[PDB]
A = this chain, B = another copy of it.
Amino acid sequence: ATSDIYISFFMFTTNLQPDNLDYRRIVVAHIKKLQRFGYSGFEFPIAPGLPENYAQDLENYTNLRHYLDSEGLENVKISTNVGATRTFDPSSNYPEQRQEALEYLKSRVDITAALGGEIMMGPIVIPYGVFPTTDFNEPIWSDELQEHLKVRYANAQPILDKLGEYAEIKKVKLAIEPITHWETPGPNKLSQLIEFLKGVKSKQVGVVIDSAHEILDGEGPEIFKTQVEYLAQQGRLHYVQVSPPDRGALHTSWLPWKSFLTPIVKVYDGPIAVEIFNAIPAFTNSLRLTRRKFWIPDEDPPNQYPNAYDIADEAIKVTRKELKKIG
């Protein structure tokens, strides 16, 4: 059987605005267009909010799921992208901060489930893009950063274990993401995340392997193959993302399709998500995007360059072509 191919909503946005009724229409029109190219599911980033609004968020996303269902999209699956934040930091040295971070992550597990989702992924250990500094604002890197991170990882392990026990009841697999040093202080490599997981009893807490992050920071195809086989053995290879090194066009890139996908397809039968970060205001600065935007039909004025749908269609075509070569 041919695998399910999903696409990330980072082609359009970092905020689903589940309460904005006019925006829901835009979400549904994108999904219907994308489905015609063969996409069977979508990754929804869950924008962070205030802790007093957890119940209201759950209600809004429940209403978004119901609206998608009422539009004929019952069979469409959703995965979520969720990140720890400077405030909602489970690796904090302060117990109350960690507990507040756990409640934040439990809320996001609830939203994932309300969307019918069975996969919640992202940088849920160390806050995304929050490179640590001294009290006098001096950066902390290399050896000093690695010593600092040991304490953060020790702080977070029991919190992630508790979140795993909770997510298991909810039937949501937790897929922690190794992300490149260019974007976040850690975990950057699959070796660093594997080391973190040794202190988390719950197998509900596993990994997402994203090809862009693996190529930018990983240890090569031989070591990678051993890590893939280990994760599948442990029952911790929860999700897989295909994304080029520049995070843009998937069909013109140095993504090592054969070397990356061959070991994964042997042991993983879940969905493969196309994760393309469009040059939208949320990413131009954080990802240093010098490339032109894949203009979004109806939002952006048309131009002579490829549009968001052009790129999405070529992305699924290349992914299927390359998957077919491995079979």
Chain A contact residues, CB within 8 Å of chain B: 48, 85-88, 92-97, 127, 131, 135, 139, 141-143, 145-146, 181-182, 185-186, 188, 214-221, 223, 245-246, 252-256, 259, 279, 284-285, 288-293
Dominant SS among interface residues on chain A:
loop
15 contacts between A and B (CB under 8 A): A85-B135, A94-B95, A97-B97, A131-B288, A141-B285, A146-B290, A181-B246, A181-B291, A182-B288, A186-B290, A188-B290, A215-B215, A216-B254, A220-B252, A256-B256
The chain B residue with its CB closest to the CB of A92 is B94
Chain B nearest CB from A119 CB (Å) reads: 24
Assuming A135-B86, A142-B293, is B288 touching A181 (CB within 8 A)?
Answer: yes
10 tightest CB-CB pairs across the interface, nearest first?
A: A94-B94, A141-B284, A142-B279, A85-B135, A181-B290, A219-B252, A215-B254, A94-B96, A86-B135, A143-B292
Closest to A84 in B: B135
A289/B181 contact (C-beta < 8 A), A216-B246, A253-B218 known: yes
Give Cα A315–Cα B143 distance, bound, in whole angstroms.
Answer: 22
Contacting residues, chain B, for A259 (C-beta < 8 A): 254
Q: Is the CB–CB distance between A253 and B220 below 8 Å?
A: yes
